[PDB]
């Protein structure tokens, strides 16, 4: 069903895309998994840990 929706997103069903290296302009030889993940910043601040 996830694969099915990736067609409706008009993006690769394997969820991998070929990426261009912004430094060199060389492509990475193979596609990689890209996409949105939900991230969080912890109560652990380096500010305190110093």
């Amino acid at each position: 069903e996830i694969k099915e929706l990736l067609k409706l997103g008009d993006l690769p069903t394997s969820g991998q895309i070929r990426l261009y290296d912004g430094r060199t302009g060389e492509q990475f030889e193979r596609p990689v998994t890209v996409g949105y993940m939900y991230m969080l910043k912890l109560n652990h601040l380096v500010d305190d840990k110093m």
């Binding site: 380096v46 500010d47 840990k49 110093m50």
Partner: protein, 51 residues
């Protein structure tokens, strides 16, 4: 106060000084190793991958 000058003197001392890095637990003697420290911005210590 902390002017530009301060940083330069720090640089000269840190030059050729070795500093010790320690991780608990001290599993073995190499839980502490000596390195030449290189100053960077930020509050984070940088460690070499190999060690």
């Amino acid at each position: 106060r902390e002017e530009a000058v301060v940083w330069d003197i720090l640089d000269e001392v840190i030059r050729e000084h070795p500093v010790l890095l320690n991780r608990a637990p001290t599993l073995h003697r190499l839980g502490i190793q000596a390195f030449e420290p290189v100053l960077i911005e930020g509050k984070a210590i940088q460690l070499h991958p190999l060690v």
